Each structure stands twice: as C-alpha cells, then as structure tokens.
Symmetry: C2
C-alpha cells in the first residue's frame, strides 16, 4: 500500500466544496506528489491536474484556480480541493509518486453526484 | 504533440512479436521514459511496466522479461516489445515523461486481437 486516501469516496452535491487528501507511505519517494483524473469510461485518458512539492507548485494550464486548487500540507501529505463541485468534475481522482524509478498510482477516489 | 508513436495502433494475432516505439519531442524533459499499460475497462488503473534511461533499466517485478521487455534505442527513442502476444496483453499502451514538473502521457496505442 503506497498511499492512503482520506475520503475513499465522495458523494458530491452541486456547489459543495470537496477536499481530498493523499498520504504517501513509501519509505523514500522522489520529491513531490501528482494529482491525476480519469473520466468514468474505458480508454479514459489520465489527465494531469497539479504537481505539489515543498519548492514547486504547478497547476495545469487549462484549469481555473478558483474552481480547483492543491496544496502540499506536509512532507508526505498532499491535498486537492474542488471549490464548487460541478458535473464536469465527476470522475476518478488519484495521486502519483516515483520511487526508485517506479511510477506508483494510488487507488481511485470516486467523486460522483448522487444518481 | 509531446510524443511521436510509430505504430499508433496494433491489430495483432496471438503469438506475434509486437514492438512499440515512443519518441519524446519535448525540448526539456527529465531523464528517462516510462511505459504504462491500461486494461480495456472503466475505472481501469494504469500499470507500470518499465523505466528506461541511459543508465538504468527497470522492469516491473511481476513481468517475465522473456515475455515483455523494453529498450532505449537512442536519446528520445524508447521501445517496448511483447515477444508472444497473448490475450492478457490486450489493452492500451502509452509512455510518460515529466517536463516542467508536468506529467505527460502519449496517446493510447490500442493493442487488440480482431473481434
């Protein structure tokens, strides 16, 4: 288990704030943590959202920072915030880290509207 | 266009040797390239298959190097070879590089038997 996700799953409502946390459990990973998205479909592209580290913060160019944001809370603790949840943000969220040249991906966090 | 993929799609037969190729076209990129795999399903997770660089080659611990192997042909050119195409290997294959702290993924290369 390389990660621990704080909400394992979110049942969203329109306009709600949604916050996700990712804790890295690997003994020595490379610096930083990466948030990624996949839409609920086969052949879904992995979509880069944000890179988070002590010294560097990178939000993907196409995203609006007033809608989605991320933060490095701690050495091994990273968060992602959807500020007012919308239907186009529905899908799977997960984080990523390198350790000894191996890319790791956390479990998927389903973030969906009621039904 | 972060990558040039030389077979953009494979329609294979069982037992055939399948070689994929990835060229990194970004001008700044971290050392190395990574080959990933994704099963043909919703909520399918990306799987690490190999890390290739000038110095190190790292195959996923569960893979038989006589069934799947990788190779760095030259700078900005990387290869993935499925030695004997079998049903367990059907899905999408792609490459990953970090550049300006962004995680990049090539287009999916679909690799399937005829239906």
């Amino acid at each position: 288990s390389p990660f621990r996700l704080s909400p394992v799953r979110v049942e969203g409502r329109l306009g709600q704030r949604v916050e996700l946390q990712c804790e890295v459990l690997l003994s020595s990973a490379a610096p930083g943590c990466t948030w990624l998205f996949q839409k609920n479909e086969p052949a879904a592209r992995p979509i880069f959202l944000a890179y988070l580290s002590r010294s560097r913060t990178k939000l993907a160019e196409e995203l609006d920072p007033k809608q989605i944001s991320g933060q490095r809370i701690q050495d091994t603790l990273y968060s992602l915030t959807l500020h007012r949840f919308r239907k186009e943000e529905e899908g799977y969220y997960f984080c990523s880290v390198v350790s000894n040249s191996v890319l790791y991906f956390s479990a998927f966090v389903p973030v969906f509207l009621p039904v």
